[PDB]
Symmetry: C2
Subunit: 39 residues, 2 copies
């Protein structure tokens, strides 16, 4: 169960980092879309 | 350790669910941006 918990924490950290990066990417993409939609 | 694994799996699977929703949101907004920029 300890061996289970360590890899569970590792994948959780990886997923959280990926989610944060994708949230930043979403913010940038929607900012560019809003800027381009003016024309 | 069992309790730790339980709530770890809980918020982990919540994280991948949110990540998948964010992935599809990025895909659709990118498609919309490409469609607008095509013309």
């Amino acid at each position: 169960i300890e061996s289970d918990l360590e890899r569970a924490e590792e994948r959780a950290e990886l997923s959280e980092g990926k989610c944060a990066e994708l949230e930043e990417e979403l913010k940038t993409v929607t900012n560019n879309l809003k800027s381009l939609e003016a024309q």
